[PDB]
Amino acid sequence: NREEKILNREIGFAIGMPVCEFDMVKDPEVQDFRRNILNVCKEAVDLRDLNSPHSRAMYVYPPNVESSPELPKHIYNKLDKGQIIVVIWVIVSPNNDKQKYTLKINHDCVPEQVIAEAIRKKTRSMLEYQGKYILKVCGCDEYFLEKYPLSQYKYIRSCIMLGRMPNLMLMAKESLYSQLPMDCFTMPSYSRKSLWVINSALRIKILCATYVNVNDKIYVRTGIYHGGEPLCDNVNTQRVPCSNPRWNEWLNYDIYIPDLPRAARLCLSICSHCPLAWGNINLFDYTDTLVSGKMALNLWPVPHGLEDLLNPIGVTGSNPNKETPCLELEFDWFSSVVKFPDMSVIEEHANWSVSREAGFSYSHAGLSNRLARDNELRENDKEQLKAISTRDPLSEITEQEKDFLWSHRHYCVTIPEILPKLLLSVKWNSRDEVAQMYCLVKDWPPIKPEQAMELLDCNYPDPMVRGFAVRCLEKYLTDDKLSQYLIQLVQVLKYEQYLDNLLVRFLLKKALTNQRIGHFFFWHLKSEMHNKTVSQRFGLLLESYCRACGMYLKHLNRQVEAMEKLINLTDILKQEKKDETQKVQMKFLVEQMRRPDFMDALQGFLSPLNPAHQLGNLRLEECRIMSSAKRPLWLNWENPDIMSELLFQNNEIIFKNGDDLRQDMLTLQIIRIMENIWQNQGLDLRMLPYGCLSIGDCVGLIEVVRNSHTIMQIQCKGGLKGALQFNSHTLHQWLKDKNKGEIYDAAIDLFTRSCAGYCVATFILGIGDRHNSNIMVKDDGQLFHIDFGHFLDRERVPFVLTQDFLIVISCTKTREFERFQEMCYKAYLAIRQHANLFINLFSMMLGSGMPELQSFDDIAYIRKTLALDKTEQEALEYFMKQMNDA
Numbered sequence: 001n002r003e004e005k006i007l008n009r010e011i012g013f014a015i016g017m018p019v020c021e022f023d024m025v026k027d028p029e030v031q032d033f034r035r036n037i038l039n040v041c042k043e044a045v046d047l048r049d050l051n052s053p054h055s056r057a058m059y060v061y062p063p064n065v066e067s068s069p070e071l072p073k074h075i076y077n078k079l080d081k082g083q084i085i086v087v088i089w090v091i092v093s094p095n096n097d098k099q100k101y102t103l104k105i106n107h108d109c110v111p112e113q114v115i116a117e118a119i120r121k122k123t124r125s126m127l128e129y130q131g132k133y134i135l136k137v138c139g140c141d142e143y144f145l146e147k148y149p150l151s152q153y154k155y156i157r158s159c160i161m162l163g164r165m166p167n168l169m170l171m172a173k174e175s176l177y178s179q180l181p182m183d184c185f186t187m188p189s190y191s192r193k194s195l196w197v198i199n200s201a202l203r204i205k206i207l208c209a210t211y212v213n214v215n216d217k218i219y220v221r222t223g224i225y226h227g228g229e230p231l232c233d234n235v236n237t238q239r240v241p242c243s244n245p246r247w248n249e250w251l252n253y254d255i256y257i258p259d260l261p262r263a264a265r266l267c268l269s270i271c272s273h274c275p276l277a278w279g280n281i282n283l284f285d286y287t288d289t290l291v292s293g294k295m296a297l298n299l300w301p302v303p304h305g306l307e308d309l310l311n312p313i314g315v316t317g318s319n320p321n322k323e324t325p326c327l328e329l330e331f332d333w334f335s336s337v338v339k340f341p342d343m344s345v346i347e348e349h350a351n352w353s354v355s356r357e358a359g360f361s362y363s364h365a366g367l368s369n370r371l372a373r374d375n376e377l378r379e380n381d382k383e384q385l386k387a388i389s390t391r392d393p394l395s396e397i398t399e400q401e402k403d404f405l406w407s408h409r410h411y412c413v414t415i416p417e418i419l420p421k422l423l424l425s426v427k428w429n430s431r432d433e434v435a436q437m438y439c440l441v442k443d444w445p446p447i448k449p450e451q452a453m454e455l456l457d458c459n460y461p462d463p464m465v466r467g468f469a470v471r472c473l474e475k476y477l478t479d480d481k482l483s484q485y486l487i488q489l490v491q492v493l494k495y496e497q498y499l500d501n502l503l504v505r506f507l508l509k510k511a512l513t514n515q516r517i518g519h520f521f522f523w524h525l526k527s528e529m530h531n532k533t534v535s536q537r538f539g540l541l542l543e544s545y546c547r548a549c550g551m552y553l554k555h556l557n558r559q560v561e562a563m564e565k566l567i568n569l570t571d572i573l574k575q576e577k578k579d580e581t582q583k584v585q586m587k588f589l590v591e592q593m594r595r596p597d598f599m600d601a602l603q604g605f606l607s608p609l610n611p612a613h614q615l616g617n618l619r620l621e622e623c624r625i626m627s628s629a630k631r632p633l634w635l636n637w638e639n640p641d642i643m644s645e646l647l648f649q650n651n652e653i654i655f656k657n658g659d660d661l662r663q664d665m666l667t668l669q670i671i672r673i674m675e676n677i678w679q680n681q682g683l684d685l686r687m688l689p690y691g692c693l694s695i696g697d698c699v700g701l702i703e704v705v706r707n708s709h710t711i712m713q714i715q716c717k718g719g720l721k722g723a724l725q726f727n728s729h730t731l732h733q734w735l736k737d738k739n740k741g742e743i744y745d746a747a748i749d750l751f752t753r754s755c756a757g758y759c760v761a762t763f764i765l766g767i768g769d770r771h772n773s774n775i776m777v778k779d780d781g782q783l784f785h786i787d788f789g790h791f792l793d794r795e796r797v798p799f800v801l802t803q804d805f806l807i808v809i810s811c812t813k814t815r816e817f818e819r820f821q822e823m824c825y826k827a828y829l830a831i832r833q834h835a836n837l838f839i840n841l842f843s844m845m846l847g848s849g850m851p852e853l854q855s856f857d858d859i860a861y862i863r864k865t866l867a868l869d870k871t872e873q874e875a876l877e878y879f880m881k882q883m884n885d886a
């Protein structure tokens with residue numbers, strides 16, 4: 001009906017594919033997903049409409065807050081006896097005259113209390129109307145709707161740290177609520193055995209192949225896997241000529257069918273040894289059914305630099321493009337459909353196995369190193385389990401250590417954080433052990449979200465394990481932290497066996513409960529729709545999101561359309577007008593930007609970098625085509641916020657169409673985390689994790705930091721014509737000229753602190769080497785880095801402290817450089833202590849096709865730079881040596 005067909009066009013524009021493509025998919029799982037996911041949409045809508053309009057205002061404008069109200073000791077010191085000075089603005093006339101009221105208030109004040117005192121100062125002039133008012137940040141669309149202490153709001157904490165005066169606007173409730181239009185979720189047209197009693201070894205037939213188009217013989221190599229680990233020995237068909245690709249071969253593996261775990265996967269590949277193509281298949285379907293009968297798999301091309309003939313970290317499922325090597329399989333058949341057993345059966349088997357081992361005599365337990373001896377665990381080996389739990393995720397557990405953990409599996413519950421080590425020590429090809437592990441996991445106590453995230457990576461495919469990890473996230477993950485780790489959580493969806501799972505339901509709920517979260521959820525999902533390995537999953541999830549997010553769908557289509565214009569325009573530059581002058585390129589740009597359909601599409605929408613930023617009219621006089629060969633556009637928009645002068649009058653963003661910005665995006669995430677760690681640990685090393693967002697196949701947006709210049713910019717602008725640019729003091733003089741008088745010390749102080757941070761950060765992450773063009777400096781002396789090209793690959797210092805920077809700290813033999821060295825040393829230690837977090841963050845990211853991050857071996861570089869297997873004092877000594885080598 002009318003509204004449904006219009007809604008489909010909108011959704012089709014949002015994603016990039018029409019909805020009716022999903023209607024044509026004749027696959028029970030896809031159609032079930034579309035239908036069954038709608039319960040989450042329904043729940044999310046009902047939560048929003050629960051306590052209107054305030055319930056719906058907090059969905060659209062959620063409070064951007066820190067996870068804790070506790071201020072680190074140095075942050076509290078900046079207050080005047082624990083009190084912050086805030087300025088409160090009121091638009092009083094229809095003429096829009098601004099009146100400011102400055103307050104000195106407690107840092108932990110509730111917004112309502114801050115509004116009360118603002119009215120007290122306003123009423124003083126005259127010598128009523130209580131809580132009909134809300135606070136807004138001047139210059140952007142962020143509100144303080146919730147009853148948090150004022151300091152806990154990020155903006156106000158930033159203003160404390162940076163020393164800035166926070167400028168808030170007082171605003172009437174019904175003005176905001178009026179703007180929130182009544183969205184209307186509607187339901188779409190599409191919305192409406194045997195068990196372990198099988199005594200046999202697993203066979204799989206391989207019938208033939210087609211589309212094996214090529215220039216020795218060929219053969220199919222197969223293997224049965226659980227995650228990265230082979231459940232048994234791999235098995236191969238015979239070498240037969242490529243002219244007649246027909247085998248007809250029942251291959252017998254070394255697995256009892258009853259032992260096949262839930263996430264068991266067949267991994268196959270056609271090989272000439274060189275693997276020509278590959279494919280993986282779940283042996284169980286989404287309904288717990290062991291898959292039987294004839295089946296056809298369209299294979300994928302091999303990725304570059306894949307050593308083994310199989311690809312078990314590879315994504316499961318048939319290729320969308322059916323003009324690729326196709327392989328016809330056939331599985332076994334029995335007297336009925338075979339289903340994986342219920343938890344009740346699994347518990348009965350597990351409880352049976354537990355009491356049987358309770359009765360094992362000394363000698364019986366002698367026969368296997370995996371059998372627990374009850375009441376014979378001493379304090380020495382209890383400490384060994386703690387030491388094993390306190391190691392990194394890339395540390396190899398030996399087969400003796402595995403037997404050992406598993407022997408003491410019941411004691412491991414008293415040290416919950418050991419769980420990922422205990423799960424890797426399980427033999428996932430024993431139903432006896434797996435059933436006990438399920439039971440241990442069922443009652444396993446809650447571990448921190450940071451630690452839980454590891455169990456969603458590619459090492460832990462089992463749904464009972466993943467369900468627990470998701471369950472921890474639901475309990476302990478704040479929306480702040482969800483936003484922070486959102487990109488990793490989006491990636492690990494690729495590792496899920498089925499479209500309908502506990503993780504995707506968790507993320508979608510939050511995306512639909514919190515528009516900040518939904519924004520980036522949409523863009524992260526939309527940027528990989530080119531990647532046919534994930535297009536159907538992400539496409540269907542985007543369909544469900546767009547169908548249920550409300551009016552924000554209209555605002556996303558603005559942004560999508562805006563990016564389509566920029567992608568269209570820059571494609572014309574780097575293809576049609578490839579090597580013309582800057583004048584002729586700029587002329588062409590202006591003429592095409594000024595066309596009516598272009599001109600409306602590129603103004604009056606929300607910044608995809610930060611949707612609280614309204615992008616008004618273009619300042620085309622400030623827009624330019626940049627010197628980088630890929631031709632990134634520098635774009636300047638007006639900020640149409642009434643009090644834009646207070647935050648920033650102009651919002652300017654670099655749009656780039658050509659290069660992969662996913663690496664830069666990951667490095668900037670990490671820099672922010674590292675900084676949070678330091679700021680919580682009490683040392684103020686101010687970093688600068690500016691906005692960076694990938695929106696497609698090598699298309700993306702970069703925030704411009706206002707009042708910033710590269711080192712060469714400082715050297716040239718400060719360098720006489722004819723002369724050479726090599727003058728090292730020129731940087732120090734520039735900072736001296738910008739920061740005259742008593743301000744000078746603060747500039748040098750912020751310069752050292754920021755430099756010590758980017759020294760430590762770049763060394764650890766192994767960033768691409770630093771030019772004078774790569775390093776930047778704000779006018780107040782804040783140093784930071786821009787083009788983070790690659791990471792993770794004797795080990796390199798990327799940021800070699802040349803004289804220029806060292807003279808600004810002072811030059812080597814001084815009290816100023818010693819204190820700076822002590823900043824770097826203490827900084828490096830803090831990240832070592834949190835090594836597991838960063839190791840886990842990178843590990844969740846292997847599903848992304850980032851070239852510098854394909855195998856776990858890539859992540860190992862962090863184990864070398866952080867020096868984990870060494871001691872802490874010897875690790876500080878390692879760092880000292882790598883820097884003095886220079």
Ligand SMILES: *C([C])([C])=[C]C(=O)[C][C]C(=O)N1[C][C]N([C]C2=[C]C3=C(S2)C(N2[C][C]O[C][C]2)=NC(C2=C4[C]=N[N]C4=[C][C]=[C]2)=N3)[C][C]1
Binds near residue numbers: 712713
């Ligand atoms: C003398 C030789 C005469 C001086 C000159 O005339 C040469 C000037 C010069 O070479 N410049 C280098 C390029 N810049 C323009 C900029 C390029 C980039 C900028 S600014 C930024 N910024 C974003 C952050 O805010 C500040 C600026 N970023 C990037 C960029 C980024 C950022 N993240 N990832 C990423 C990848 C690629 C590029 N480029 C003029 C001076």
